Amino acid sequence: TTTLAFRFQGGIIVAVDSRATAGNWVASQTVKKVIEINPFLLGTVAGGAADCQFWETWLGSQCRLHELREKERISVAAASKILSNLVYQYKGAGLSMGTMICGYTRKEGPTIYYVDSDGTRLKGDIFCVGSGQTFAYGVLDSNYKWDLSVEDALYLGKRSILAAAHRDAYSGGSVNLYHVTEDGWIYHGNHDVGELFWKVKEEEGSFNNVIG
Template structure:
């Protein structure tokens, strides 16, 4: 996605998905980082960003802006864990993202999906789009590739999916976007976040399903 970028500034044309299920969340993304829309600067980027032991974020917009925001949130969540002697809730992390993005909305190109598990609410997904609003959602998509898969998500998403069904839903959504969006590509990275921790999954580019592409 390219919003108000200066010449030479790297943007995250991308596909991001996060889905809550009973017991946790699954977050997924492609791995292509582009500049200027047509130039790929990194084809194996890890866009699933750690912010706490059971909270990750997915970043769209300017790579520099979103990385800076994520680093600040990570720092404050570390302070929270020390002060409260417990892992921070997902809502706290999302609120920090929202405050930073809203207060700096005229200077940042940053869209965030914040997702994870905590003992208070279980698996939670929050969307913080550009402008700095915050929305708790059963699932969220973002990035340039998300516009290609709204129909798939609307028709295929079901409440109370199992972990395995949720993984397949996210993987298929990212694969469909990769097939249509020129700014999405590479491999697929997934993270399954539950009370037991984080499991990472990697689908290499040559194993990404070619779905619906003639």
């Protein structure tokens, strides 16, 4: 798995791979690792697929009940803390979760919270989680700026997953892109790594080690 999310001028970019493995066996290449909590909030899945799916879907139900009661959009801080407090109750039981709760509100602006099944909860600007996180971090750290355009930021997130997809044996399949704005998230398509790699190699001139 490789999942990333980073804050920038134009909001948040969320990018994930699509591979699911059981040991060496590739169970699926078409897995959705972005949970659409609601039209304004996104969550990434790493670690336990069920644990992330179930509890973030559940989180969406809590966010809905909040804004029905309070007649107001739930904050990313509050949403993330509902999840972190939940998993903390289950601490020790064996839940496996590494997720970025991503959102864009008026009072907070674009916000990303790393939430962990150990109970960790961290606000930050850039996060990478999964077996291929170190590869994605390298591309991000070297190329990241706050004043990135929405076009370039989307590419950077795509290219960083590709870097991990290539090197990490347990990452790949395809890249899912999302762009989170104040008015909601916008899906930016599924991108097969196989086709993307040759496309990027040629156009960018990178991956000279690989014969194409």
